[PDB]
């Protein structure tokens, strides 16, 4: 008769219960407490301008129709009971295609305390939009948002609040980072209001502040470009009688810069401006192309003005290494401070 | 109070016939559509389509759903939409679409005292539009979205834009990385099939591609390789290995770029405007290599005239290329 008592209680709670009506319909405003536990912060995609996140999305409200008195104080019930009562229609404003996991069963819980309070958590995987300003690529940082609210109930019917102080209402697991080229510096929790064609709604927002790690692009792009520029300046030390040899130096380095220039934007979206990387390959392109014009100038003055041709080669051995050294000082100091 | 509201909603659905439209066997039911575009993305020339996310609202009056005594707009749980009649609206050029369902199905039902029903959905769709890439990448594309009723003809249903020119909002907040929406337009008309005449609403955008990306990726590398081929003229005409290596590499590099670009584009059978430039640059670097071959063939018997050709090539080739660029950039802009 122990389990029979709880069966009678659930029958009485659901008898005459209408789940098409929010609690306090026409009398007050339904308040929903919300908090998030981020189990993993998934990879950020730059081509699609998005990111993935896995959360334990918790919601809590009050329903006087579900008050009861019995041997227990909390009914830790099955997740199929969640479809028998009223639950908020929370959606993510900037979501793209989220998933509610149901393996091996619907990953939801429902707990009904004796005073009517409900706790209703679920496990989700959200793909959210994150617009990116890539004018400082790859030394850029972003604040990717996560906005959610009710889809049908205006702010005069359903409102949302954080369970605790807003800073402590979103907690990220210590070992959940799935980021490869970013670095979660922290998150900011806020709340706002949106006006639509149907009414005013409450929006709860979280911004995750990410800073890109430049380690990959130093190896992939910045080093192959610097070596190519240094390679093209070896041509200044070969004797002027090695005309076929000094032409191969100029042609291959220019060809190599073209290959690197094309392949640098493969990962990025097709933006219509110049990133901080494009200003480095373009300048490295100018140094490599200038090192070939110098040879043509030297080769033009050979056999007619040997004194002048020798003077140019002496100066180029100093000017070209010095100017590329100065440019790197100006380039790195400009962008690493931002 | 709340027991009175429950009694009212049950009475509305008691005896309700979901199989019959409002005013069945009578005047056509008028449905007004609003669209609130959330984002446009993934405009793909490879698949000839685009992705559109929007809040799609419909608005009609059903006298079977009229209630009195409650001075409120009853917002109901979205699962009640499975017991009411809703229009069978579909999108004809839609390749793949879904209604978002996290945390619940993103759907809205809101009743009004006189019987009006507001029905909103949050829809992500991949509509289709064929693009004319003859002027690529300096081209404008007109990609639409056709909205139509599937089973009900104009004798049974009528469509209109709710709010006229203001029916569709949110377009001005769209910032595509590669395009720029110039103008959107709203069209209402009828379409006739073998089964009758159906109402249609068409939403169309006029995209325009931003050229700043292709200057860095395609035009500048081609121009710099073409200029690289002109250094061969200042080199002495008796240096066979130097000038042949310079001429050959530019010719082969120019061929590589033309093939490399066509990976991310469909196998269209015509000549895009970008192909004309890459074929125009190929002719210049191919003639420069042929120029040396003439000099190398003639500089033994006639040493003087061989040097004269090299001196003119320093003027004709830079001047003619700037003339080709003048004609190309004025015809396509």
């Amino acid at each position: 008769d122990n389990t029979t008592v709880f069966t009678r209680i659930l029958d009485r709670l659901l008898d005459g219960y209408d789940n098409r009506l929010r609690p306090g319909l026409g009398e007050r405003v339904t308040e929903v407490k919300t908090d998030i536990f981020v189990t993993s912060f998934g990879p950020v995609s730059d081509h699609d301008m998005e990111y993935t996140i896995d959360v334990f999305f918790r919601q809590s409200w009050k329903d006087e129709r579900l008050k009861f008195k019995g041997p227990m104080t909390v009914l830790r019930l099955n997740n199929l009971m969640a479809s028998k009562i009223w639950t908020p229609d929370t959606f993510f404003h900037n979501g793209k295609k989220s998933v509610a996991h149901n393996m091996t069963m619907p990953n939801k819980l429902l707990r009904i305390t004796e005073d009517g309070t409900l706790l209703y958590t679920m496990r989700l995987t959200v793909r959210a939009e994150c617009p990116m300003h890539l004018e400082d690529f790859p030394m850029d940082a972003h604040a990717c948002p996560l906005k959610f609210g009710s889809y049908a109930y205006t702010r005069a019917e359903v409102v949302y609040e954080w369970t605790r102080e807003p800073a402590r209402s979103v907690v990220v697991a210590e070992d959940g980072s799935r980021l490869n080229q970013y670095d979660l510096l922290g998150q900011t929790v806020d709340s706002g209001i949106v006006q639509s064609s149907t009414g005013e709604y409450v929006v709860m927002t979280t911004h995750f502040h990410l800073k890109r790690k430049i380690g990959y692009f130093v190896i992939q792009t910045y080093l192959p470009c610097i070596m190519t520029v240094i390679l093209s300046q070896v041509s200044f030390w070969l004797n002027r009688e090695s005309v076929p040899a000094r032409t191969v130096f100029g042609v291959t380095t220019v060809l190599t810069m073209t290959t690197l220039s094309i392949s640098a934007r493969n990962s990025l979206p097709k933006v219509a401006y110049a990133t901080a990387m494009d200003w480095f390959i373009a300048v490295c392109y100018a140094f490599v192309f200038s090192a070939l014009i110098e040879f043509a100038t030297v080769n033009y003055f050979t056999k007619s003005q040997p004194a002048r041709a020798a003077k140019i080669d002496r100066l180029s051995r100093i000017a070209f290494p010095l100017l590329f050294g100065i440019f790197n000082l100006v380039y790195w100091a400009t962008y690493l401070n931002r | 109070n709340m027991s009175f509201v429950k009694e009212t909603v049950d009475k509305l659905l008691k005896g309700y016939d979901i199989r019959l439209r409002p005013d069945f066997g009578g005047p056509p039911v008028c449905v007004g559509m609003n669209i609130d575009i959330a984002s446009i993305d993934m405009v793909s020339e490879v698949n000839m389509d685009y992705t559109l996310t929007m809040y799609f609202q419909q608005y009609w009056r059903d006298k079977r759903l009229a209630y009195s005594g409650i001075p409120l707009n009853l917002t109901l749980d979205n699962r009640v939409a499975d017991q009411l009649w809703v229009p069978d609206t579909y999108f004809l050029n839609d390749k793949k679409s879904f209604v978002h369902g996290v945390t619940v199905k993103n759907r809205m039902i809101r009743l009004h005292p006189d019987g009006t029903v507001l029905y909103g959905l949050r829809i992500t769709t991949t509509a289709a539009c064929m693009m004319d890439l003859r002027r690529y990448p300096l081209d404008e594309q007109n990609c639409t979205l056709e909205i139509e009723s599937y089973g009900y003809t104009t004798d049974d249903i009528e469509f209109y834009w709710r709010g006229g020119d203001k029916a569709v909002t949110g377009v001005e907040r769209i910032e595509l990385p590669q395009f720029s929406i110039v103008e959107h337009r709203l069209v209402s008309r009828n379409v006739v099939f073998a089964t009758g005449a159906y109402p249609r609403l068409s939403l169309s955008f006029r995209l325009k591609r931003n050229i700043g990306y292709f200057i860095l990726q395609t035009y500048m590398p081609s121009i710099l390789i073409t200029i690289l081929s002109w250094v061969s003229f200042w080199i002495n005409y008796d240096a066979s290995a130097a000038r042949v290596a310079l001429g050959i590499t530019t010719v082969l590099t120019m061929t590589t770029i033309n093939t490399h670009l066509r990976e991310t584009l469909p196998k269209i059978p015509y000549v895009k405007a970008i192909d004309m430039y890459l074929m125009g640059c190929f002719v210049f670097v191919f003639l420069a290599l042929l120029e040396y071959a003439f000099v190398n063939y003639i500089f033994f018997s006639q040493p003087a005239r061989a040097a004269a050709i090299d001196r003119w090539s320093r003027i004709v080739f830079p001047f003619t290329f700037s003339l080709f660029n003048l004609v190309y950039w004025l015809y396509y802009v």
Partner: nanobody
Amino acid sequence: QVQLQESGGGLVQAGGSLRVSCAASGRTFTTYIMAWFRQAPGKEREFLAAMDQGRIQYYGDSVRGRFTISRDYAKNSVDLQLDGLRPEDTAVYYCAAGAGFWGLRTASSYHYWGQGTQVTVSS
């Protein structure tokens, strides 16, 4: 050059509405956040309101329910409606834009700033 120019404001007696505008030039701020900051004389710079691309409106505690922010994306402008003004609101109002890194309510996250606009309340 990116220059956020501000108009509106002036002298208002014993409260009343007073709209303050802000026009942007030299850059399209569709994907940025346009906010409003108020600086009392010598005290500090205080956050008032904000609005991102998704039309989400943020407000401070001191001005919630009184000041309304709106953005005109087509003309690249942001406006602030000052209803129920008080003598405590007499300060200089600033127009700001930025990505809101480390918080959209912090003055250090807004890279682009306006010049200023004096609002005087007489009572």
